[PDB]
Swiss-Prot record:
Cellular localisation: Nucleus; Cytoplasm
Protein name from the UniProt record: Protein mono-ADP-ribosyltransferase PARP14
Classification lineage: Eukaryota, Metazoa, Chordata, Craniata, Vertebrata
Domain Macro per the UniProt entry, residue ranges: 10-181
Post-translational modification: Auto-ADP-ribosylated.
Organism: Homo sapiens (Human)
Residues included from the entire protein: 1208 to 1388 of 1801
Induction annotation: Up-regulated by IFNG in macrophages. Down-regulated by IL4 in macrophages.
Length: 182
């Protein structure tokens, strides 16, 4: 059930179908990507600037930084949605790196359906400052997408891409895809 075949459409990029969704992984700088939503993996204060969060907040700009701290003071949030600033996206969804990764990805998918968005790009959530294990993170991200497909929830969402800072973490994601393939 659900899983297609792993192939490489471009050097260093690997993909497979999960239901109707194209799931892709690659190594690189996520701030150079274009997608409807880019995901940030941050602290429970939404003001971290270390690792992926440093690159995202510096490239998005000061207006996005201020939107984050404004929402953080308003209520207790599991995640926040801001504009894209100077990134090539419509919105940034800022998730907490130390939280359950399957839950965080499920929330991102649901928010993207609510906006009728088609494409998402995320980092290896939790593997930076939060120091979650890469094998557990890969299993959680792919499980969230499988659950979303099984429930019949994929309508607008067509492409989910993980852009991963360390090539060694990319290798862990690729092995998990091969374990699942049809
Ligand atoms: C998960 C995470 O923070 N990754 C990352 C991305 C870019 C630079 C440094 C990094 O550690
Ligand atoms: Cl993290
Ligand atoms: Cl990453």
């Amino acid at each position: 059930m659900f899983y297609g075949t792993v192939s490489s459409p471009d050097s260093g990029v690997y993909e497979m179908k999960i239901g109707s969704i194209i799931f892709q992984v690659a190594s690189g700088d996520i701030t150079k990507e274009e997608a409807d939503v880019i995901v940030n993996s941050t602290s429970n204060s939404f003001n971290l600037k270390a690792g992926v969060s440093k690159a995202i907040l510096e490239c998005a700009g000061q207006n996005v930084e201020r939107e984050c701290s404004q929402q953080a003071q308003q209520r207790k949030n599991d995640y926040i949605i801001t504009g894209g600033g100077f990134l090539r996206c419509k919105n940034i969804i800022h998730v907490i790196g130390g939280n359950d990764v399957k839950s965080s990805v499920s929330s991102v998918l649901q928010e993207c359906e609510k906006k009728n968005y088609s494409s998402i790009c995320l980092p290896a959530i939790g593997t930076g400052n939060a120091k979650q294990h890469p094998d557990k993170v890969a299993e959680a991200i792919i499980d969230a997408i499988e659950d979303f497909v099984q429930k019949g929830s994929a309508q607008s969402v067509k492409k989910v891409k993980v852009v991963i800072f360390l090539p060694q973490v990319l290798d862990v994601f690729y092995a998990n895809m091969k374990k699942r393939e049809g």
